[PDB]
Amino acid sequence: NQVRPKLPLLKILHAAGAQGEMFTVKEVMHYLGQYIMVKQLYDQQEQHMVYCGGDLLGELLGRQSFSVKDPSPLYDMLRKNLVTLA
Numbered sequence: 001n002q003v004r005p006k007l008p009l010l011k012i013l014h015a016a017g018a019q020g021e022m023f024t025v026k027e028v029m030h031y032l033g034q035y036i037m038v039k040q041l042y043d044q045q046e047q048h049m050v051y052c053g054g055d056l057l058g059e060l061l062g063r064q065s066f067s068v069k070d071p072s073p074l075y076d077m078l079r080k081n082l083v084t085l086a
């Protein structure tokens, strides 16, 4: 249940304070949330929206925006960008 993130995602996690390069999925989600907070990508007035266009996160998602009410695009990105070790 350890995952290794592809390099661009790893860079994002480190930017949010993560250390090392092996993580649990729980850790990955924690640090991604923290990244969104530190980079000010959330909408303060519409707190379901993340505006990730023009950030590396948007590049990974292939999106300008996503809603936390629909985790599908984020989870699809994570499936593609995480390597699960035995």
Ligand SMILES: COc1ncc(-c2nc3c(n2C(C)C)[C@H](c2ccc(Cl)cc2)N([C@@H](C)c2cccc(Cl)c2)C3=O)c(OC)n1
Binding pocket: 029, 030, 032, 033, 034, 036, 037, 042, 043, 044, 046, 047, 048, 049, 050, 067, 068, 069, 070, 071, 074
């Ligand atoms: C002050 O404004 C404000 N404050 C807080 C939020 C917010 N809300 C949720 C979260 N945060 C922050 C930690 C980013 C986390 C979360 C974690 C990782 C990602 Cl990559 C995206 C969201 N999260 C979990 C519970 C989560 C779990 C599964 C899927 C998703 Cl998309 C999000 C929410 O719901 C917010 O969102 C727009 N806006």
